Design a protein around this ligand. Structure first.
Ligand SMILES: Nc1ncnc2c1ncn2[C@@H]1O[C@H](COP(=O)(O)OP(=O)(O)O)[C@@H](O)[C@H]1O
Ligand SMILES: Nc1ncnc2c1ncn2[C@@H]1O[C@H](COP(=O)(O)OP(=O)(O)O)[C@@H](O)[C@H]1O
Ligand SMILES: [Mg+2]
Ligand SMILES: [Mg+2]
Lengths: 220, 101, 304, 304, 220
């Protein structure tokens, strides 16, 4: 599958354990919510998946390739396949929106014309094509979040990871962001959303829900 | 006492020879010191590097003169010490002769 | 709510700033070493300039001419000859050195104390110094010949009088010293500022947090001032030590050179006054550089 | 997926890095000035050293060999030794100096117009000088030393660099050269490192985002390498200009001194081949310092 | 009153206006919620109150003293009276908790013994006395937020400003944090909480609610 765990567990240096014997499987195209409490291991799970921090106990398989002991020189290639969205909508205030959204392509050293067309397509898909030449300061919060999503999804990622993307938005914009994620999933992009908002997850029961509780994953 | 008399004569002859040598070496040292006083060549007064001269050869002359002066003073000290020691022993011999008398 | 004494806070800040240098050893050590070297080099250049100036001032004498009388010449005869020479025209002045005064001058040199004592009666010739009224070399030669033919002397000695060459060398050394000292002072002043800027940038988060709270500007500024002052002090002390270690070697080399001839020479090191001025200059430069750089970089930091 | 060629990306990075220096003109100008001065110091020192060496070589380059006979040898044997030396090969030209002639030379050196008295005729030993008939300096010196040893000559003072000796040139000059080279390396290798560390710190967020997306380390590093290379090149050019200005400044002072002496002289600037070496050194130091410091500081910046 | 506005309005350089003719009055001891939508002027209001950004139209009075044109040299004295809490719980990870909580006192150059006793009192009040010597990394999110509140309140502020303090916590810890703020208000410390969570404000109707809508303040 797109990702699989085999009794993976993480123990921090202090001695506190975020994850203990967590096992779940994702099939291509599916979407998940990964609910948890104020503690739990949501952020630790999202950090583990994209290889920012290595595990200790088990093994991780992305597409049948072990990621347990991936050499540090191969991490960028793995990260190129995964798009990440954060609550903080990390954006470079100095540069323009067209530059922020184009960074993943320019990292690969792609020709300028293809970059332009692809970025225009992505911004149109997220509805920000008009303001492609403005700075992120002028945009409102929801526009900034949508720009972040576009930047994450520009490079045709196989798996899209969201870390509480709706932290800084009221429910009105929460609905719009969730609908945008649903559209991207319909396009065929696997997603693993992470949120502690029980109301939002209970709103839409179509997608399988995994609850994370004190480092244990019930998967129900 | 008779034997000491011959030793006394030998000591007196040695003392006379030492005095002659001391006078000769004192004259030599005096003239050498006067020559140095004439040819000081102090650097801080701009007395160095006379124009158009064999600097290496003149330096060798100066070094040889200084070495000769050092040897002369060393020899003078040696002979003066020997003469003083002999005179002290000679005076003691006279004192010993007094005890015998 | 009690506040520490004015001096207590400054002393605590100074101690904390001194302790801060241990955070990053490599960068601080390298900058301190560079500061010490850049402050030592101008010190050595100034030392050489001062030595050359002293020698040039000593050589300033107007080609004074020395006359040596016979050792056995009677003292009244020497006095009469000196009076006659003074009466004679074309002689600016006459100075008479007694045999014992010359003996003292000779004994000043090392290695002569023993010989003088050993000699029963050391008797140097009476040395008389006559200063020609006209500095012309031809006049000097004519006067020397006349004195030699005066029939009351045994030898005559004349000076080199190479004033122009030494003046030119002194001018060249002055220009070189000024240029190199200016370059080194600018380099050391600018090096400090960069390190202070990097240190300020290092703790951006703490400065933002402090300014968000009602912290004053002076409180944020003081630690960097004291770090700059410590940099200046340590650099100046290291520079003084290096200058001493260099002047010892230079004195050894000059003594070796002068040993080729029978005479000896010693270098005049920087005086007690010079070291204090060096420390003051180092401290002032460090403090000013740190203040200006840190303040300019601090104006451009917003709490949020 | 179209991808740019190997050279296109490098050229774009070079142009972009050069353009980036104008974002912070003051910070990147002060560092350039510091590098220029630090590199120009040793350049000017080398220039003066080369000029004085050329003057020393130009003044005279003859070859003569001197042999000092022992004082013990009596006068009649001097003629026999002279004849024996003349008979032997490689001794075509010979000059002999009598002890009286040596005494006269010594009296002249001290400034006396006539030979000084009260020195006697045994003041100095007789000296002979032999010209080098064979161009082989080593073989000629060995043969002369062997001949002098056979004849019992006390010393064989063959002409050589007596002034250089083992005291000044052997130690002091080498120590000064090492100190100046160390200062040049540290000052350039230091300020370049600090400036690039500051630049990396100013781009913490951008580097974090770039690493998170999946950019390779080399892509992150290259812009700072090119920034350091530009720093080095511009610093070398500025140093060359500064040395040229210093030579222009010293031309008049050197002309005044050279005129007084017989040898007319003119300052000579750095050779056109030396400028290439200077630029190569500047760029090499810039690139090495940038690589090392940037990599070391970029190790400790995690994406989150 | 503790703070009063007279037709104050702010216009950004871009031309967008966060605030337009906002007028409200706070009496000592009161508490307010300052509800708003994803846009509105909550953050701009909290920035204006603590003099981080100056106004354009009206005037601001703190305790009868005009803050409209306060000279830049008097801002620190004003900020010393106001405690600020942020959603990000800005903490210095390098230093210890006892050092983080003690920073406001050390800024005033207070004696060490008084600093120790006051910091101990504050940490005991917030329930973190046990972990006063540990680093902020080891603490969990709620503990970090409580440490931030303690650091804000250590210096006996007259007015306490909170900028969505419960952004990164699930409702379970939201209740605890709100109860802590209520206790501080009972102690006699004026508070102006700011949040877009309608449920939280509707939970407790005792405190007057000000709704901020597109830069207009209804005050009802
Ligand atoms: N750098 C760290 N060192 C030690 N413990 C940590 C570290 N980061 C997180 N933890 C702890 O590990 C557990 C993982 O919590 P986390 O998944 O990050 O919560 P959330 O999903 O709400 O962000 C928590 O108890 C947290 O306190
Ligand atoms: N630095 C800025 N320049 C221009 N406009 C800004 C700036 N900061 C905020 N704004 C705009 O002013 C308005 C104020 O919004 P804000 O009160 O900060 O929302 P929130 O309370 O959710 O943080 C918003 O429309 C915002 O986009
Ligand atoms: Mg989290
Ligand atoms: Mg806000």
């Amino acid at each position: 599958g797109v990702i699989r765990f085999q009794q993976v567990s993480k123990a921090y240096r202090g001695g506190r354990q975020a994850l203990q014997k967590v096992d779940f499987h994702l099939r291509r195209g599916e979407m998940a919510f990964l609910g948890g409490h104020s503690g739990a291991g949501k952020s630790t799970l999202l950090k583990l998946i994209c290889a920012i921090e290595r595990p200790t106990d088990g093994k991780i398989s992305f597409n049948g390739h072990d990621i347990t002991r991936i050499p540090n020189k191969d991490i960028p290639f793995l990260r190129r396949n995964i798009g990440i969205v954060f609550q903080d909508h990390r954006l470079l205030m100095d540069r323009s929106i067209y530059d922020n959204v184009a960074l993943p392509m320019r990292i690969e050293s792609i020709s300028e014309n293809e970059i332009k067309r692809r970025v225009s397509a992505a911004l149109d898909k997220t509805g920000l094509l008009d303001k492609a030449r403005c700075l992120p300061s002028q945009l409102s919060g929801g526009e900034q979040q949508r720009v972040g999503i576009a930047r994450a999804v520009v490079n045709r990622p196989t798996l899209l990871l969201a870390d509480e993307p709706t932290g800084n938005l009221d429910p009105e914009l929460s609905s719009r962001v969730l609908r945008l994620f649903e559209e991207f999933n319909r396009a065929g992009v696997t997603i693993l959303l992470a949120t502690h908002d029980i109301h939002l997850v209970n709103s839409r029961p179509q997608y399988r829900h995994l609850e994370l509780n004190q480092g244990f994953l019930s998967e129900v | 006492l008779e034997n000491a008399n011959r030793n006394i004569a030998q000591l007196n002859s040695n003392i006379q020879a030492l005095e002659t040598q001391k006078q000769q070496q004192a004259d030599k040292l005096e003239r050498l010191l006067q020559t140095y006083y004439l040819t000081k060549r102090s650097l801080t007064n701009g007395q160095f590097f006379h124009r158009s001269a064999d600097e290496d050869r003149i330096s060798q002359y100066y070094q040889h003169l200084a070495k000769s002066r050092a040897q002369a003073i060393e020899a003078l000290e040696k002979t003066q010490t020997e003469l003083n020691s002999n005179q002290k022993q000679r005076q003691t011999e006279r004192e010993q002769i007094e005890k015998l008398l | 709510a009690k506040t520490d004494s004015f001096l207590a806070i400054h002393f605590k800040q100074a101690k904390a700033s001194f302790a801060a240098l241990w955070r990053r050893p490599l960068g601080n050590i390298l900058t301190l070493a560079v500061i010490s070297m850049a402050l030592a080099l101008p010190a050595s250049l100034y030392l050489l300039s001062k030595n050359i100036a002293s020698v040039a001032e000593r050589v300033a004498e107007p080609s004074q001419l020395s006359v040596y009388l016979h050792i056995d010449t009677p003292e009244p005869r020497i006095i009469v000859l000196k009076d006659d020479l003074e009466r004679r025209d074309e002689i600016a002045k006459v100075k008479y050195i007694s045999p014992q005064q010359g003996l003292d001058d000779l004994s000043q040199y090392a290695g002569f104390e023993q010989a003088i004592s050993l000699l029963d009666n050391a008797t140097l010739p009476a040395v008389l110094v006559v200063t020609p009224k006209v500095d012309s070399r031809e006049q000097i030669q004519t006067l020397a010949k006349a004195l030699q033919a005066e029939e009351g002397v045994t030898d005559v000695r004349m000076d080199e009088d190479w004033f122009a060459r030494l003046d030119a060398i002194r001018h060249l050394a002055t220009i070189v010293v000024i240029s190199l000292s200016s370059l080194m002072l600018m380099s050391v002043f600018l090096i400090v500022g960069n390190t202070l800027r990097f240190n300020v940038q290092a703790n951006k988060e703490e400065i933002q947090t402090m300014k968000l709270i009602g912290a004053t500007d002076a409180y944020i500024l003081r630690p960097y001032l004291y770090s700059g002052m410590w940099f200046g002090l340590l650099g100046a002390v290291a520079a003084w030590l290096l200058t001493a270690l260099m002047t010892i070697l230079l004195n050894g080399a000059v003594e070796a050179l002068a040993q080729l001839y029978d005479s000896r020479f010693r270098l005049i090191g920087l005086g007690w006054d010079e070291s204090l001025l060096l420390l003051m200059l180092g401290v002032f430069l460090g403090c000013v550089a740190a203040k200006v750089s840190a303040k300019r970089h601090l104006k451009e930091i917003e709490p949020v």
